[PDB]
């Protein structure tokens, strides 16, 4: 999955998450045509009967979370990330860090993230202190002892006080932010 975002001189704001499911999807490349085919349908539940069971013509449940934050009716911040079920964690933690902690946009993005969807499934990024991790485990959590990168947030802040934009790309890939001055 990948997330990107664009703002222009007319006030349009784009926040776009896009995917083929796993890296390279199925791995199948269309013979003669060069494009990888998604494995998206494995986002459906394998045991049927539930909200996200397989049906013909149905769309498998996503966790993609392209977002635009507004203040007084106008966009101020775009957020989104790859990562499957972890996307919810990346996006909410970015928003918490920027608005509740008052971090810079880049610090909000680079702050180590955690994710846990169950009592037996945990992930954390490097920079989570080791002692604190172990103390959380003593308390009942199940963090492993190796970090993993979580998500890949690209974001634009729309600075209406100064009539400018600020873009940030996450360190977890080689993404970049590029401004435009006409």
């Amino acid at each position: 999955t990948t997330h990107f975002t664009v703002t222009d001189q007319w006030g349009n704001v784009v926040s776009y998450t896009t995917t083929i499911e796993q890296l390279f999807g199925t791995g199948i490349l269309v013979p003669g045509y060069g494009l990888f085919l998604n494995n998206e349908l494995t986002d459906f539940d394998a045991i049927p009967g539930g909200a996200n069971e397989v049906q013909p013509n149905k769309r498998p449940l996503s966790s993609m979370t392209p977002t635009i934050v507004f203040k007084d009716e106008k966009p101020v911040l775009t957020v989104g990330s790859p990562g499957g079920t972890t996307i919810i964690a990346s996006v909410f933690q970015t928003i918490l860090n920027y608005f509740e902690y008052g971090m810079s946009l880049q610090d909000a993005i680079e702050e180590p993230r955690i994710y846990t969807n169950s009592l037996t499934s945990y992930r954390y990024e490097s920079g989570m202190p080791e002692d604190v991790r172990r103390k959380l485990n003593d308390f009942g959590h199940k963090f492993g002892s190796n970090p993993v990168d979580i998500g890949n947030v690209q974001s634009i802040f729309i600075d209406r006080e100064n009539k400018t934009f600020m873009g940030v790309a996450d360190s977890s890939r080689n993404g970049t932010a590029v401004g435009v001055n006409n």
Partner: protein, 358 residues
Amino acid sequence: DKVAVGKDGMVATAHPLASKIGAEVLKKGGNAIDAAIAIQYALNVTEPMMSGIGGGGFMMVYDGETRETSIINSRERAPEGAKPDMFLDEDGKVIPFSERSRHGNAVGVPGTLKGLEAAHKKWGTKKMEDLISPSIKLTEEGFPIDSVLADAIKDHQDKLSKTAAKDIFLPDGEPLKEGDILVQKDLAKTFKLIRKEGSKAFYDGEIGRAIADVVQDFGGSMTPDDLSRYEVTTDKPIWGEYHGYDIASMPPPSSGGVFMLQVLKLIDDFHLSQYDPKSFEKYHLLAETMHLSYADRAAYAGDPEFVDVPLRGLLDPDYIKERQKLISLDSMNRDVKEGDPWKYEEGEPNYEIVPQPE
């Protein structure tokens, strides 16, 4: 760079070449939608493991003229021959993830290209040939791969070794390394076709027939009729409020918007800035909250064309307080079942709650 400023526009993407392509569109007077289209094509070439015309996505757009926020939803669909039990073997056992994720039954009908065409019809100001052309050149003439792509090839070499990927990505049996030139002649040919003919070549044409044929070759059921049936949809966002700000995010058939909003609503009353960002207290409260929200997601989230998602109940302030009884620094909560958001809805679910293996 990782951080940039600009007066007249801004792009942020996961690949430097795609960011440059989208910034150039803006420098030449295109709008953010034109640039986004060019960026998707570019990422399909340079970051081919992550997205492209073989997948789908959610493109959220705030329109600076109308002041409306809408979403071009190009999520893939199951073909008509898909069946509820297709991920189970004939004894009812779940087919292992590595296997089922490589099989043709996994392939949804792709939407991305129809998504780009819907966005261009609504908002485009540059011709589609201009927006695809930079990516034709990257595909046909090549570019030096980055580390993320080199790593991905190495990590997925077994999967790629089984398909027509192998001669491009694993030449002479060895993954391409960082800095090696990646040439994608077939992908270029495909982009030329789309440049000439539009999406008919894909959804009612030669590319489509090759998609259906290779899906069937790998055991799936997709047909050309599945391809010609597809169209994207346009969604309104799900909205919430946080810290004095209004947040627009992605509704069902994503879980993302509603559960991101729900996490924020659950944690807001704990005033987490009172705790250091790397404190036990912040991490614990986040972990306890996530366990609750992910459990509601497992129970209640799916494609709203088919199933009724209790969006109002999931975010009702009473329901948030119910769930918050289970989020405390005093103890580790092991009561992590879904809650009952339907108490705060008019109706009931039109499905069962079905445990899924982890």
